[PDB]
Amino acid sequence: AYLLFYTELKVTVTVK
Amino acid sequence: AYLLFYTELKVTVTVK
Amino acid sequence: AYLLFYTELKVTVTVK
Amino acid sequence: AYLLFYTELKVTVTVK
Amino acid sequence: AYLLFYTELKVTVTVK
Amino acid sequence: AYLLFYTELKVTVTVK
Amino acid sequence: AYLLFYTELKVTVTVK
Amino acid sequence: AYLLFYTELKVTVTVK
């Protein structure tokens, strides 16, 4: 699985 | 799943 | 310095 | 300073 | 599982 | 699950 | 500088 | 500055 970082100043960190 | 960071000076990192 | 994680589903990561 | 995550499948992590 | 960081200036973060 | 950081100058990052 | 992870279930993340 | 991850099963995390 990959860790994915979705930035908006903050970051959402998900695992797919 | 999300990685969740729970801070207290230290951080607990969990995967949900 | 500390890395500080401020959570709101997302996380702001700062260095102090 | 903020840690900034710039995603392209990979992530560039910078400190500003 | 391990988190694995594969660097190229950027990093791919996988979970195995 | 928790992310666990095991330090030796380097860090091993595991998910339990 | 190094990022240093000091674990106690939680982790303190410092920059030296 | 960049955070750089140098892997050997473990990772050294530096800031340049």
Closest by CA to A3, choosing from H13, H7, B3, H8, is: B3
B15 to A8, E16, F5, H14, H16: CA distances (angstroms):
21, 14, 14, 25, 29
Pull the structure tokens for residue F5: 């950081």
Is residue G15 a contact partner of residue G1, using CB atoms and an 8 Å limit? yes
Chains that touch D (3 or more CB pairs under 8 A): A, C, E, H
Is residue H3 a contact partner of residue G3, using CB atoms and an 8 Å limit? yes
Among G3, G6, G7, G10, the residue to mutate for chain F (most F Cβ within 10 A): G7
Method by which the coordinates were obtained: X-ray
User: How far is A3 from A8, CA to CA, in rounded Å?
Assistant: 16
Is residue E3 a contact partner of residue F15, using CB atoms and an 8 Å limit? yes
User: How far is G16 from G9, CA to CA, in rounded Å?
Assistant: 22
Reported resolution, Å: 1.1
Judging contacts by C-beta atoms under 8 Å, the chain D residues touching residue H1 are 14-15
Judging contacts by C-beta atoms under 8 Å, the chain H residues touching residue D13 are 2-3
b/e burial code for range E1-16 (CB count within 10 A of at least 16 → b): eebbbeeeebbebebe
Q: Does B7 touch chain F (CB under 8 A)?
A: no
Q: Does A13 touch chain E (CB under 8 A)?
A: no
